[PDB]
Design a protein around this ligand. Sequence first.
Ligand SMILES: Nc1ncnc2c1ncn2[C@@H]1O[C@H](COP(=O)(O)OP(=O)(O)O)[C@@H](O)[C@H]1O
Ligand SMILES: Nc1ncnc2c1ncn2[C@@H]1O[C@H](COP(=O)(O)OP(=O)(O)O)[C@@H](O)[C@H]1O
Ligand SMILES: Nc1ncnc2c1ncn2[C@@H]1O[C@H](COP(=O)(O)OP(=O)(O)O)[C@@H](O)[C@H]1O
Ligand SMILES: [Mg+2]
Ligand SMILES: [Mg+2]
Ligand SMILES: [Mg+2]
Ligand SMILES: [Mg+2]
Ligand SMILES: [Mg+2]
Ligand SMILES: [Mg+2]
Lengths: 325, 325, 325, 325, 325, 325
Amino acid sequence: NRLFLGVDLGTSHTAVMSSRGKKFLLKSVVGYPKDVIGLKLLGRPYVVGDEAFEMRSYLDIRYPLQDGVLSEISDRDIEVARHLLTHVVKSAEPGPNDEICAVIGVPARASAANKALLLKMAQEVVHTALVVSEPFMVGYGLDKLINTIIVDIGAGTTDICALKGTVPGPEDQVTLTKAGNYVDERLQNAILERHPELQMNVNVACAVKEQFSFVGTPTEVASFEFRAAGKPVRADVTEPVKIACEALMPDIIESIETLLRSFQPEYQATVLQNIVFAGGGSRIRGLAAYVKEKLRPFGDANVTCVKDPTFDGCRGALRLAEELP
Amino acid sequence: NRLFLGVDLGTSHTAVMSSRGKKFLLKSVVGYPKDVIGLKLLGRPYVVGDEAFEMRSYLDIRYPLQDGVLSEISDRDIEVARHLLTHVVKSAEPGPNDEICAVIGVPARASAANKALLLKMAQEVVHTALVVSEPFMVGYGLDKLINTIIVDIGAGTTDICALKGTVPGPEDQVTLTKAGNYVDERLQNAILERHPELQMNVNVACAVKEQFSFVGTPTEVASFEFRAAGKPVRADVTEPVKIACEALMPDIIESIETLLRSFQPEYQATVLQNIVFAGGGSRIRGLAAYVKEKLRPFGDANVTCVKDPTFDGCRGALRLAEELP
Amino acid sequence: NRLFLGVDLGTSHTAVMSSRGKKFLLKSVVGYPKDVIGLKLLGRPYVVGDEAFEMRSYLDIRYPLQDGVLSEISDRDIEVARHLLTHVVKSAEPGPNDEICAVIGVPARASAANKALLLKMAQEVVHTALVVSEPFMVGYGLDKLINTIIVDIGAGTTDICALKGTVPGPEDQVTLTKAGNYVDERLQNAILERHPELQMNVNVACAVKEQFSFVGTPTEVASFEFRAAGKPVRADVTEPVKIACEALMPDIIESIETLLRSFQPEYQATVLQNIVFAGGGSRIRGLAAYVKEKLRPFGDANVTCVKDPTFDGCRGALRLAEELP
Amino acid sequence: NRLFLGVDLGTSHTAVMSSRGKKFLLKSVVGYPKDVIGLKLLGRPYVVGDEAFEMRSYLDIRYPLQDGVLSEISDRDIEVARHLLTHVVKSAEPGPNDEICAVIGVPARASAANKALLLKMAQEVVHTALVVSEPFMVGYGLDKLINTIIVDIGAGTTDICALKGTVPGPEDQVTLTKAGNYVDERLQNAILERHPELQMNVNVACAVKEQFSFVGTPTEVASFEFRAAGKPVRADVTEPVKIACEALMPDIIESIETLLRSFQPEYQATVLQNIVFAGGGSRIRGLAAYVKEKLRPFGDANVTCVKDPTFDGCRGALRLAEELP
Amino acid sequence: NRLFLGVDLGTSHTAVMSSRGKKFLLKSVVGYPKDVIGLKLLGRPYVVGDEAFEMRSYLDIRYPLQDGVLSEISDRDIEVARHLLTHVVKSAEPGPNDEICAVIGVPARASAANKALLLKMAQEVVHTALVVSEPFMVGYGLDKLINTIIVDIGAGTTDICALKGTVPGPEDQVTLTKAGNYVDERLQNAILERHPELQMNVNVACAVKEQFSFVGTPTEVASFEFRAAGKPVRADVTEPVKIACEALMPDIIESIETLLRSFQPEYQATVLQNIVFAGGGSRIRGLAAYVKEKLRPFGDANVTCVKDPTFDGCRGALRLAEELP
Amino acid sequence: NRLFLGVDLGTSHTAVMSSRGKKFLLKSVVGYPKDVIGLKLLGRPYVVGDEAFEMRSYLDIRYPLQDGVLSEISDRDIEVARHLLTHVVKSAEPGPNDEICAVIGVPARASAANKALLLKMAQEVVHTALVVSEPFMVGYGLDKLINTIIVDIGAGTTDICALKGTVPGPEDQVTLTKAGNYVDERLQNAILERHPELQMNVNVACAVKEQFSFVGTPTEVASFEFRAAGKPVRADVTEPVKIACEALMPDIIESIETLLRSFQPEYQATVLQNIVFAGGGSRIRGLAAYVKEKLRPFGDANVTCVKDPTFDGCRGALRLAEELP
Ligand SMILES: Nc1ncnc2c1ncn2[C@@H]1O[C@H](COP(=O)(O)OP(=O)(O)O)[C@@H](O)[C@H]1O
Ligand SMILES: Nc1ncnc2c1ncn2[C@@H]1O[C@H](COP(=O)(O)OP(=O)(O)O)[C@@H](O)[C@H]1O
Ligand SMILES: Nc1ncnc2c1ncn2[C@@H]1O[C@H](COP(=O)(O)OP(=O)(O)O)[C@@H](O)[C@H]1O
Ligand SMILES: [Mg+2]
Ligand SMILES: [Mg+2]
Ligand SMILES: [Mg+2]
Ligand SMILES: [Mg+2]
Ligand SMILES: [Mg+2]
Ligand SMILES: [Mg+2]
């Protein structure tokens, strides 16, 4: 028997669909206990996913992918990734006589090396595996494979991928490193710039951003409970957050504009009425409309942010390997 | 039972009439999907005609005839043509006990080799097939088979054909390569000369030309929405277009003059009052009158551009094989 | 066979648990008889523990640890500590074929020198021995190894130890010298300040404190029978005692505040709802609530004083070496 | 003083002879540098001839003649041609008091328009200029001006020209577009058909063809070093090349047959014993003999391929204007 | 009067040449004193360049460019960059009546945003400024502007730039983030993997790498004096270092291979005999030869590492704006 | 007008410098007469400084700081400290229109409470006052603010302070309680251990120590005139004294080692060549060299004991507030 997988193996969240109807999401992160006590507390030699990030306190949490690309700045990060992947496959619940055929998404324009490392690292766990551009397999998740831009803004990477009809490209892709994560790093700097007394780690501003990110007009008051020398402080982050999230957008815009001019002229109009935002960063409030406005120089853009950014990635992959060799 | 066909198998549009009252037109073009995704998008292994040119984005559209002559610069282009032809016959709707007798038009003075390739390639689909000059079978479509010039200006080829009474000639024919398509290539160069920022492919200027082509006096403002680095730009193409379409005409004129002087002197006066333009290029605005003027040195020309350039080709063929063995 | 020990080797009270179910407590103190008559009275060449402190009159009682750290301000104090330790092991009742594995607590941030001197001095008596922070092994005694402060207020030392998850720290520890004992010294001075006729030694005020210590609101009348020029005098020590015990607290508070601001901001809220007081000084009346109030500037603290301050120290140690190499 | 020129102004090579004993050949091509860097690299504002084609990399090389006819699909191509022509005259080395009388060859049956454009464009550089059929001025180059066919196969055009005695014709000429260049386009398609991994541009297959072209029997192994995804690959092109170059020949043959039947019957036997191949395409291996065989239905052809295809064109022109007004 | 500048504004080292014969190099880094004492120690409100990195101890050293791109993850980093740039211009020594025309290099395929931020930020200091690809302005520094690859491996970025003749590209560029810095991060992880007791910061391994980096065969013993718990330790880093620096190379190779296949086939051979390494990372021992070997599948590469990696960057820029508007 | 003060407010000796050139030293101690006769003898209601310690016989001498920290184990000790401080300011000789700006040193890592109590208690006497780490203000007294350890060994406290560049730390400080005084206590015990007939108070051994303290090799005979049952006895204290003063050192060493491993590895070598001993305990004979030897495991230490331990403390403070707001 055969089981196929959609694995959008994201730098922060790995989503997974299976032919047999698992949707599940998890954090792409593996906790190791830090010492012999951690090991005790944790009750197992490592954790993966959201439990790891709950116990983030007393585990060394290791993201196995940053810049989406599967990491090798340590010989350890290979073992991490093994765990992660082992765990996502295992949490697909399959066997004993189940032949796992998988689709993995990566960042578009992730090197052959890194596609090979995944591919290898999957071909350790699943027998047959397939590595495609996230943004494309998004697009393929919506039948938008034609005269379309996607802009997966994610965490690690904003990928932007003209679906210049069907061939999923490698000059029709683009990736920026300015993505979610960089917004937080920034945001944090934007808050620490103005309430210099604050403690923020990035995991804080991460959450400020998730909760109040927007662009353009501030539609409300962005008030958040930070700490300062340990003391609770409520503070206004409207302006940090504005700044932060409208620091993604320049690059995305310019890099749509760039893809747009790659399409045949007869179709550019039509492309613009197909610009998509998928992935986390596509949940920014007012994004849509901020883009529209940024693109008026190219025409009437109709920008849409997908329905459920959480799975469109895998949804696609899945459908994709519902359908071939 | 017997069914006969008029197939004006043109380089850009293949028109077809049948004895049983199909008129239909289609683009002479066959799309293949480019990759395994295309194949999916397209829903079939190839398309032919105007759907192919809609999906031009993500299909490799292959015209199977350029210079009208049926192409062999690939072993593939034979299969293309098969598809085209298969499809035009099939869209004539005939069977199961229907013996297809066909007339195909070609460019006048298309080589015996090429007439044989069609003929062969039709005798694969229809049982009995007949390949004549387009311009003649136009002329035969209007009872102008005597002391007449036609000038089929088409896409690929302008053919020009003295209907030196009845024998349809091979020194009374002429073909130029400068035809529609060459107007576009040119036009495009004429626009890209002056708004060097523009993108044009030829399929754009094609459309500029269809929409604003004229000769002589510019009767209006030729304003068109081009792209520049992706940005919409409205621009004035009156002068490009003038230039472009009055780059057909020299050769046509000289080649009428040339046919004219082939006729017996007693009749040349009379010929001139019979010059015809058939085919697409005959839709140029002001053509008629521009020719008249070009021909004053030979006399009072009365130049006419046929009633419905779309079918006169096949109309003829049809009538033609309504009437013999 | 193997026997493991929890030895909370405190500066005033050494508690001990064994795997085989001894709990016992004793005073960390060894009496030597003062002279040849003492030796006679005492019936043995030294005592250890509460009998020593009964006979405190006519023995030279030598605490072998002050500031918890095991003392070397005499070459004698090494022999003392031997006796003490010899006696606590021996009162664990083990042999003849018993291999003693021990955990000893010290003050958190006791020097490597002093951990070595214990360690040595235990590795004289037990074969394998382990020296950890008291406060941690408390915390480990309550599964509170995460986002927790403990404050062991003891006699010698108040130790305060963030259980910044599991690694038991050395910037996440703190020790103050102001602890029990310093309260008494003080208290005494606070009583001798106002009833200057009184005799107090510290061993008196030690007992006033044990009996009436509180902080904040005086919940009752602190009347105690002191002497003056030998003459019994009952006197009111409510205000001495208030003063005395609320002279611990500043430092503790400031040093919790300090540890609190060491945790990641995302968790400080959570820490505060985990502040513990263990050890003797944690028996102060109203401590809990006085702390809560001192910490309102950091949030809603939920401060708890452990269930049985007497053993939580060793309890832990025990459990701790119930569980590894 | 007077200086006369043979200029065979070919679509790929322009040869030139002068009365004063220049033979030189050059590529009919003018490089312009592409940008402000090119301009720097090139050291001059344009190049012409073989240096242009060396620097083909970083120049926009523009052939100023395709289909031999002097191009006007750009207003630029007029300036190109100026450069070319300016340069071929200038490289004839003449002045200051030298009156240049020139013979240019064109494709036989190049329109009056195009003969006028050259003629004009020469009468800009030389004072008196003469435009004749290449094939004829070849024939005139060999005293074969009688009962002769030539077949200039060139690059752009195969011209074929009955030398129906002396009047050089315009129903005794013929030109096909299928010539050299079309062999390459084809060849390339024939190689890319079978080693679909290969890169070929036409400039490659051009070179495969020059190096291995033949017809009929493959006299050797046609092995050539192509690239595939950049990787060197040696591959066998014997069958591509067969296919390609025997795709010229049908049209040539049919068009000789056609000229042949134009001659008076008494002479056709004799004509056949005079069929010539001039020009590049006449260098195909085995051509001679392949034709012979193709023409057995007409008799014993004696087909010859001229001695030095490089100059016979101009050689003629030259001689030609060594001899009149 | 006019003064022009070559500013290779690198992420670690900014080199600068002026028309008037300054070469100088500095570290691209600005030290701010950390507190009111730092300010005192430092004697000025900020430092820039190598003094900043000497005083790295007690300054907050802020690189104003990482990933070469000029940073905006802080509103501060703009002021940094101002200082840096102010300082590099000022250390060009020019005025009072000197009009500074500059060339700045960036990473090839740095966004328009970032070219604008520099450009702006230069047009604050110099009046006219120009921002080009480092690798190109290298290539232009060696007349290698044709059928050439460069691979600037630097610190931040390895840029790899086909000099596909002269137009300096934006599909003919490539940048990787795996560059010097990433080697150190890695290396450090590679050493800390094996001598887990070691302290390394990256600034250590940075120096291990500078001193012992190689690839392929270890030509010697890589012994280095690290610290462990403060204690000097000499250790062997041959294998870490191997690992580390041969973790650049995959991406570079693949991305040459990729550029190579972008060139016209006729030239790829020739390209390969032009592959350059410029910039710091080009100082790796045995690089050359390791590449050669990696590229044997594409042919005989002749890889060269430039003469003086320190200035080729600016050298170029300089020459470049020695020569135009 | 403004007058600034260096007050190194030490637990045994308070040194003071003023801007106007007072150096003076005094004992940090206030004598009160014990009774109505003392009051008569003393001639004033209290003394402060060395007269108090002369009359130590018949005054109750109260150090107002032990452990350096300003004492509160009595409500009296606040009045003491007032007197002391009143007297050190007053002996700075300033008024009537003099605004006293002061720097007071404390033990590094003295609690905020205690810094506040001084601060308060100075802001009673001087208008503006500043409380910093002694060891830092030493270091600042020698420009050694960088990659330096100091070890102030004093009386109360040995402070040890990495001058981890400029920010004066609170994890880069350390204080031990084992300092001078603890040496004496010990020494005394070391002499009473061996000449059990002796009387020593600590004030005796204090003086033995001052006079004969050394470490390592005994460079001479330590003979001193003690009493026994009142009877003068000369006795050899070489071995007591060895023992005593080499009981400081372990902790200091371990706590340098500890700070050393806190510095960045690149600098630890360099730190070691900057280890300082300031303060009284730094007068121990052979200290320097004994440390060197203790630290060989970290490298070649170059340990220096400051020039004039008496004032380096205040010297600094002074300079310090010669230089700011
Ligand atoms: N509601 C939100 N608003 C803004 N950013 C968000 C939101 N939810 C998630 N993100 C950001 O988008 C990223 C998560 O999107 P995701 O599709 O998982 O990224 P990836 O799949 O590349 O890991 C993170 O950087 C996160 O902070
Ligand atoms: N001798 C060397 N061996 C290996 N890498 C080196 C060497 N010298 C410098 N580097 C590395 O190359 C980089 C410096 O090169 P550079 O041209 O200045 O980079 P950039 O200009 O992008 O700042 C750093 O990452 C450094 O560690
Ligand atoms: N010559 C000496 N040798 C050893 N210790 C000394 C000497 N002089 C003073 N001391 C000790 O050092 C301390 C005095 O140093 P000091 O800087 O005044 O300490 P503090 O300033 O902390 O009161 C006293 O403990 C004293 O016994
Ligand atoms: Mg994603
Ligand atoms: Mg037609
Ligand atoms: Mg205790
Ligand atoms: Mg020719
Ligand atoms: Mg560089
Ligand atoms: Mg001191």
